[PDB]
Amino acid sequence: REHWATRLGLILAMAGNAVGLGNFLRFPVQAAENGGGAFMIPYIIAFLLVGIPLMWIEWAMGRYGGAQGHGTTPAIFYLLWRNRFAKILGVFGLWIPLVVAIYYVYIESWTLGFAIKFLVGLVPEPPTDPDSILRPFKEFLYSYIGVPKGDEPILKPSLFAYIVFLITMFINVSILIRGISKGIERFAKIAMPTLFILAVFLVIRVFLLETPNGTAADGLNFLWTPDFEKLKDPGVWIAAVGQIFFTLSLGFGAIITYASYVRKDQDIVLSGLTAATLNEKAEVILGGSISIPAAVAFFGVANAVAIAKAGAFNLGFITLPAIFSQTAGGTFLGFLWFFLLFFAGLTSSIAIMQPMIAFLEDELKLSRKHAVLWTAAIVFFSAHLVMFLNKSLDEMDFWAGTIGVVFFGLTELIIFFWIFGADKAWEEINRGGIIKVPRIYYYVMRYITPAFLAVLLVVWAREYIPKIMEETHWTVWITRFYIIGLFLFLTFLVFLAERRRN
Numbered sequence: 001r002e003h004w005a006t007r008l009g010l011i012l013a014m015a016g017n018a019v020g021l022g023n024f025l026r027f028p029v030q031a032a033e034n035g036g037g038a039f040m041i042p043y044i045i046a047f048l049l050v051g052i053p054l055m056w057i058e059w060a061m062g063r064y065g066g067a068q069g070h071g072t073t074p075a076i077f078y079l080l081w082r083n084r085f086a087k088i089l090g091v092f093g094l095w096i097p098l099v100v101a102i103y104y105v106y107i108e109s110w111t112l113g114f115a116i117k118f119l120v121g122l123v124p125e126p127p128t129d130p131d132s133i134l135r136p137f138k139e140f141l142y143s144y145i146g147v148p149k150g151d152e153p154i155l156k157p158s159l160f161a162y163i164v165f166l167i168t169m170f171i172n173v174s175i176l177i178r179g180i181s182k183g184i185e186r187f188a189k190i191a192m193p194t195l196f197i198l199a200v201f202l203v204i205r206v207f208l209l210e211t212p213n214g215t216a217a218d219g220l221n222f223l224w225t226p227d228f229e230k231l232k233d234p235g236v237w238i239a240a241v242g243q244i245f246f247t248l249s250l251g252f253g254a255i256i257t258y259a260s261y262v263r264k265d266q267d268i269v270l271s272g273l274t275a276a277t278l279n280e281k282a283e284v285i286l287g288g289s290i291s292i293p294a295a296v297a298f299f300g301v302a303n304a305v306a307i308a309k310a311g312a313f314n315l316g317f318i319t320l321p322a323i324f325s326q327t328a329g330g331t332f333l334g335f336l337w338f339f340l341l342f343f344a345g346l347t348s349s350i351a352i353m354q355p356m357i358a359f360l361e362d363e364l365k366l367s368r369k370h371a372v373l374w375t376a377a378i379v380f381f382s383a384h385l386v387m388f389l390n391k392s393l394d395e396m397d398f399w400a401g402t403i404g405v406v407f408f409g410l411t412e413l414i415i416f417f418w419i420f421g422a423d424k425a426w427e428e429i430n431r432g433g434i435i436k437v438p439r440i441y442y443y444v445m446r447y448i449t450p451a452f453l454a455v456l457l458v459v460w461a462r463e464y465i466p467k468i469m470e471e472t473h474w475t476v477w478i479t480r481f482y483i484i485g486l487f488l489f490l491t492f493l494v495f496l497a498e499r500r501r502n
């Protein structure tokens with residue numbers, strides 16, 4: 001089996017997995033919608049009671065499986081629990097990352113396309129009226145991905161966007177095809193440093209922004225000022241947990257796959273802890289100190305929150321660059337912003353494609369080259385669904401990147417810390433660890449975490465089961481139909497892999 005060359009390379013590879021579009025895009029929005037400081041309390045709690053224990057659990061399961069030549073859940077679940085149903089459940093460890101990757105890579109191609117156009121200097125040129133400053137960039141984004149005037153189902157992506165998406169796919173392949181140590185590890189040792197330093201630079205510059213309407217400092221205050229009146233709102237907790245799962249790449253089966261390349265005897269405790277800690281630093285300190293504080297600076301808190309509630313891409317692809325355009329060298333600043341997003345997204349996109357590749361290599365015994373090329377083909381082909389179908393991206397993000405990851409996180413924990421045995425799991429987690437997990441986390445993993453996730457899922461289902469059936473748009477049923485097709489497709493490959501073994 002292939003392994004990580006150095007401990008450092010391992011750490012930065014995992015950090016590149018977590019730290020991504022979720023930090024500079026999803027987080028600012030989630031925190032803004034949930035009342036800044038009021039969102040932070042549940043967020044931290046969710047990080048302690050959910051993020052860390054699951055992180056360690058996934059690392060353990062990964063290395064455990066990897067030692068026997070299996071990096072994906074279909075096999076690993078079976079190793080932890082003997083049952084056909086264990087394999088069927090493990091199919092999500094492939095379905096989830098694949099579905100998410102389909103649209104994730106596309107968003108990543110956006111940041112790239114933007115990074116290019118902003119570098120060359122081809123951008124809209126605003127003239128004191130907020131709308132007259134934002135409108136040009138709204139039209140700019142809409143022209144790029146091809147957004148309809150009214151609410152129309154079909155998207156018309158510009159040739160440039162499509163070509164950029166091809167390039168993005170190429171870059172992803174060029175990295176993945178070189179292997180774990182030579183391809184992913186090498187890139188991580190470069191991208192991450194660049195990323196952190198670009199992020200750092202952007203946080204400085206942004207913090208310097210101050211206008212008659214507000215300051216970046218007002219934004220930092222808003223984000224870090226505690227509010228206890230929102231603690232009784234379940235929605236805040238649900239959003240916090242969802243963000244923790246997404247940002248830490250938990251429930252995507254990515255962490256597990258990466259961990260399967262860690263040598264049986266190498267530490268996963270301190271490594272895992274360090275990776276997660278880096279992500280949070282990149283999330284709360286970097287991610288939350290760029291977008292929000294800038295919006296608040298120019299438009300004020302109220303408007304900033306309104307803009308955040310407007311959409312997820314509205315703050316990242318429209319508001320921020322529009323704000324930069326009003327400053328000296330704002331065009332170049334916008335470039336660094338999209339270059340940062342691109343490197344963050346690229347480091348994550350490769351991570352959610354690897355689980356599929358690892359399955360083909362491990363279970364179907366395909367060469368790395370073939371495994372990568374076929375994975376890219378599937379993603380690229382499926383991407384047309386997200387590219388040309390409005391609301392398809394949202395549907396995938398929801399079913400896979402929201403519900404799926406939580407459901408899968410609960411499943412893997414139940415299989416590992418319950419069926420497989422709590423003590424055995426604990427012993428497996430701490431084995432070889434440079435430091436040992438606090439004893440208390442034993443009771444967190446076995447009782448607290450699973451219960452909280454279960455309650456969450458129950459609450460969700462109660463609200464969603466009626467809404468699903470009554471949804472007017474056909475694009476979602478097409479998306480649903482197709483991803484269900486993808487699931488069946490993957491189950492069939494597992495069947496073949498199972499048959500080859502015999």
Ligand SMILES: CC(C)C[C@H](N)C(=O)O
Binds near residue numbers: 017021248348349
């Ligand atoms: C799906 C995951 C790879 C997402 C990543 N953890 C992020 O924060 O963007």
Ligand code: NA
Binds near residue numbers: 016019020021343349
């Ligand atoms: Na990343």
Ligand code: NA
Binds near residue numbers: 248
């Ligand atoms: Na992240």
